[PDB]
Amino acid sequence: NFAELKIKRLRKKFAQKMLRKARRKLIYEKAKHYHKEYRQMYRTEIRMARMARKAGNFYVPAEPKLAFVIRIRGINGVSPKVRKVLQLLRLRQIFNGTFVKLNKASINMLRIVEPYIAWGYPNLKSVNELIYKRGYGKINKKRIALTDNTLIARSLGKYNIICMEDLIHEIYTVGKHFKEANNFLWPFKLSSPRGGMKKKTTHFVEGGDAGNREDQINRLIRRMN
Amino acid sequence: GVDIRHNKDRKVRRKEPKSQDIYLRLLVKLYRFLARRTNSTFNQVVLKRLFMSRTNRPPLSLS
Amino acid sequence: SAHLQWMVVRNCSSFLIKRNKQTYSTEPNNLKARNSFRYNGLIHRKTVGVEPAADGKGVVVVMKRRSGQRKPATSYVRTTINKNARATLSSIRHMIRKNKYHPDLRMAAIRRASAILRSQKPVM
């Protein structure tokens, strides 16, 4: 007879299509709320600096919790402690990059690798452009380019990370599931820096490129990305 | 380059029996199909055990 | 059976021929003439074949019957079709489809029949 089978599979296809449309409205309004959150986070530090200055006092800002680390020195001739920490930072090739949250263990891990990396505090434009341009995902331990939101939602949906905006939000505002979102992100494969490094072997304080550039990593991401 | 060591880059396990028996290979042609197209892992274990060697499928006794 | 015969024939048959990184099978009921389980024409219970007639016009189509499997003389039935190109192919198409007689290779039979017919119309 089939006149009920066709109408049932039409209703089922329409049901999952309306489900997908509701999910798209969900991630739209989540991205709007994220934009409002970033406005508040950017103006709040300025407003508190202003009230401290007009009160005469100072305002030590929040010491940053999110760094981006880039391996600038190659495979050859590495101390074994250093190559072990570079493996735990997942910086294997030269000019790889990873996000890293900061605490007492991780700061000393970055210190024990310091001549081989350039690591800094990335801003929201840096996190955006690294995710959209070079950001891939370790799906089934393969390397699938994040071309759709379903590739993120199938792996990280149980952490309420269902779109790339949620991914960017947790990376920038380091959340509870930063470990899982970060470990989902593959190590970034950046190109060699256009314009070029000033000096690879010496520290940034002494006019080189290694070590803790603080927020001058947002000049170097723009030209390695 | 990468800092990857290639010692254990290849699994050693079998893909097929090393026998040119044809009845065991027809059993393998059946259980490849049941292993990849059922969701029961009994088929995977019996596929692995058809793959194995005479010394790794030892004779089970009636007792 | 069929797969049992195939696991013997697949690398040992005297119709098999291997040179120039290619492989073939020169058995008399092999549509597309290539060594496969699908197209081999000896190891099956039912099989078509498309051959030119002994006369230089038409196509003899060969069917394998059901009952006499172990009787090779009265196993194959041969029907000679000597007509236009459209109705020859429609005859082979109906013969394979509407009998449900091994429908894996109706299209291979139609390709081979058309190849015989273009070779059998006079050469320019």
Add this chain to the structure above:
Amino acid sequence: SGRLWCKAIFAGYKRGLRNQREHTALLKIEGVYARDETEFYLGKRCAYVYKAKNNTVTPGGKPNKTRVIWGKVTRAHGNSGMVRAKFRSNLPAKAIGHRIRVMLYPSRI
């Protein structure tokens, strides 16, 4: 009834010191000696014209002895208005210091 090509000299191949890469010609174009001035010549049709012994065809004309190797002008090379180029066949090293024409007709004006 006059010249419709700029004058250029095939200075060398694109080369490191102990390595040369023959897929990219280096053209020194006469008159332009700075990168602000080399911008007009990017993407231009450039040509190495030479004669030979036996006759070849000529499009829109009679068979004669002149021959060509065509090419484009890809991008600038260094501060002195030296430019790179890529040709269909790589140039013979006969041509080191010979007049490659740099046409005007892939025009952007």
Add this chain to the structure above:
Amino acid sequence: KGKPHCSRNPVLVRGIGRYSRSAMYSRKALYKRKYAALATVTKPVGGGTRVVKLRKMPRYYPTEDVPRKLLSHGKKPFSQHVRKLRASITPGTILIILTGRHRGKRVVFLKQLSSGLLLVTGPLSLNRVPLRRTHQKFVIATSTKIDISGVKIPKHLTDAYFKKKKKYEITEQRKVDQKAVDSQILPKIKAVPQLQGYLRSVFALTNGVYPHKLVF
């Protein structure tokens, strides 16, 4: 049905409409526009009546066949491409043709033809160049314009009119269109002093003369 309207979004940039989805809901007024809910011919034969089948089966089959391509989207054919001009080419400017048998010669530009090519006459009384097509890229456009806003080219000349047929013979309508457009162009360039000599002369690069240094 109804009469089709034009786009209620004014286009802001390409791919972005100036109005959001709620504002365009309001402008379309979709609050009040809801809705809810071949092969055989029979021919007489003087027998009986035969059922002729159009689109018959194929007679022949090639012994093996290519498969169907995947479907891509943005790859239009040439006839419906969008066509761009340079800013330095306006109807009335003078051109320096660089490639063909009319190379080097200075030429009045008429209009943009429908197939990307430029319509051309540097008038045949001056430098012996007819109503000819040319390519935009292969032409230097000098900064010398004439005000041809009140000339009427014949509308019956397109790419289909200048397209090559198959020795070559000049037809009569070529000569008639030539005189009909020269009678409008040539008194308008005799108004500008020393312009007819400029169009009769040719372009050349001499010694010490470089195009990147010279403006035109």
Add this chain to the structure above:
Amino acid sequence: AALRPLVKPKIVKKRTKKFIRHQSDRYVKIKRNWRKPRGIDNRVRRRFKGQILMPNIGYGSNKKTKHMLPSGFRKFLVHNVKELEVLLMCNKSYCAEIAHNVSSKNRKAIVERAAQLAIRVTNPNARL
């Protein structure tokens, strides 16, 4: 009108020069057939700059355009006329060669049978 194939790709070859075995220019006792050399001081085995190249796997042709003649076909060596009804089906991909041993009065029958069966023979007028 030749017998054109089904598809005719752009056969790109990574290397057209052969691999000369090292010091085959030098002696006559060394033939030009490549042998990877196992020297301890060998300038080629340790691949110095400007030396004789080595036949790596990366020089391998594309699988779609491998063993392919410049006409678009693939060779198939044929001895008798009974080995052309094999290529009766593979008409638009695979061409036939007649072996060097095959006599003229059989090569004639092979060529006329391939002309009937629309199979390109690479050497159709070999001996005559």
Add this chain to the structure above:
Amino acid sequence: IAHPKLGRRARARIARGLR
């Protein structure tokens, strides 16, 4: 609304509300 099991009737109701 946008997750399947608990928002099924809500998606059904907005589907009716489209009509």
Add this chain to the structure above:
Amino acid sequence: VLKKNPLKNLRIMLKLNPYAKTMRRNTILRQARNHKLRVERAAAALAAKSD
């Protein structure tokens, strides 16, 4: 699938993030409006300087 670039390519950016459409609309409207405001203030200051 060929990875296109969401920063350069627009509808891939919208597929990954549909709020980027209204952000990139509102910023075009904002920049055009600020532009005409600064042109009107420049014309007003030029007229007041002329007087």
Add this chain to the structure above:
RNA sequence: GAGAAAGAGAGUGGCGCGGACGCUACGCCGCGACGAGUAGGAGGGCCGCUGCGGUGAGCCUUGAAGCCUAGGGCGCGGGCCC
């Protein structure tokens, strides 16, 4: 291919005869990351030589083996076919 453990599952009551390729399953196809190498270890050779059992209704005085070649070619290569 679909972010969300699991059925396009069954029962009881209120004209035109049509549809490409495939699948030597040891086959075919899709994803990712990867490629240094002496001594050495291992795998695959439709690389090569000689002879034997099978086999190609194989080839050959209408010219086999061998050898020569500024001829056409294939293979990353051992080599091979005209």
Add this chain to the structure above:
RNA sequence: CCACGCGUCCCCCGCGAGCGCACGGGGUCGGCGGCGAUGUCGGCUACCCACCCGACCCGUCUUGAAACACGGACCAAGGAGU
């Protein structure tokens, strides 16, 4: 403003249809122009020559060989984990 209905119970205050454009799961043209029978066209490869860059002669013992370390004039056949 990714907000659009009607109907009721509670509290604070599950199928609408069509057409179409496309920054949308990897290039197409539903665009063209020339030359071609005794001198022209294609053949990367293989024959000779020219030019630029590169470029020390192999085997072996060796911490290290182009070595002022030893073996080697050249060629054909035989020739060493059975």
